[PDB]
């Protein structure tokens, strides 16, 4: 739709590519900040940090993903051409309870996110194509609600899917590394159905690079030809725009992953780059002060995102294809 | 909208007065069935019971409120000219928690309610207008959410507001009666706002009648003229169509109420008529047999709903006036 079209435009760069900078972390940002004090850090500090990354980096990113809990200040503080995505999900899951069931931050509607200047709504779903139906019917129902909400509100709905298995507790394990292709791919095929009214898929690379021939410094799980195929399968697995999420892999492995994707023939439409662009500034902020972090950002930070945008320009494909 | 209008007319009769049978009760019914033997009521017992009541009485009602968990079979069963609304809220709330927070039926969405052929979608909300904003911001956001879904799914949004005040535990008290008009009327003013996309309001009569002059075998809270102003204020409080909920008052007093309503000037558009009119048939069903309960429904049952319809034809203004 036109307004949906207009809105996704504000989140992409000149070549038609989404280059959002992810900074919607909450409980996780506190943890990282903990380490340098290590004592509980203030809401004030946490907002302030985001504001800095906002202020200093938004000029080089085509958009930013921030959270309504602490990111509203930083989102006022953002740049002009930059654009904006707002996280709608409650963070984490229940360690006690089964299913990592989805749940919107209780003081928010799609309507409230739109009135706050957001160009898209994002929502993180933990899904597992093999979990019980009683689990997945809920997760499904939920997404239909957001799917529907957003349509009435004329605002892009970006679905983030993270994959998991109760059987396979540990994520980067060899055992899970075998099933990731199915788990990721299959989720996309499902949530590509029109009844979810999804606009862009936010997803992980369909393999775990750390076990790809020519990348692994331990056990290999797929040969390059194999893994190239899994990317192709992923490209084909949806007909909607998709972007890759870094998911705490490094600035440089992720850079290398894009070129790899591209060369397998994956026509992906951009990225969403998080911990791996700004993370060095957390330390420099706590240990060494405000203008100290402002420095890192204008050098180590800008380099990281430049390097990224340059790789992206050679690798990604415009979302309008 | 074109569809919402055409759908509401599936719920009214052809003279424009909504006369919906309330039969969405869950836990509440289940107990009833165990008030005839202190043992278990089965999932398919409840189903066929609901079926039975729907088959008989939906001849003489222009719509039926039912529920997804126990009323899917009865919804197929209904008479052809009976409209269908499906409940969307989890029944009750958490008694250990504070603010009677609302919550959808986990396997549902306004999309999956339309897909079962519901001409309308219903949400009972407990609202106290003077409750803390930390509570009420959640309520408003939740309603904003459901409203959008229904806009997008192009289906009517019927919101029911039952009022309360935690400072006044007894709803039937003299202290409550005094505050009732504002609690009721103000919540109508809030939820008539465009952001909540409400199509029809299911609301209580703005006064406790047990204390209106010349109705009050006890103590008076308002003169006939004060009460009339409260009905007048109610009708004025909203520009949407609204229908009154019997709220467990007797058939006699309720009927008497609709006359007072019409006389004060309230242009109310019908009633949601509740358990009172089908109750008696439960004990006959169980203890007396299936063909017996069917008789009750054809004679006693018929009578209660027919009577109401008559008072209704002499009292309610059309939702389209």
Coordinates of C-alpha atoms in Angstrom, one line a residue, chain B residues 85 112 240 300:
Chain B
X85 CA -21.4 -12.3 17.9
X112 CA -10.2 -16.0 13.3
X240 CA -22.6 5.6 18.9
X300 CA -41.4 -20.7 29.5

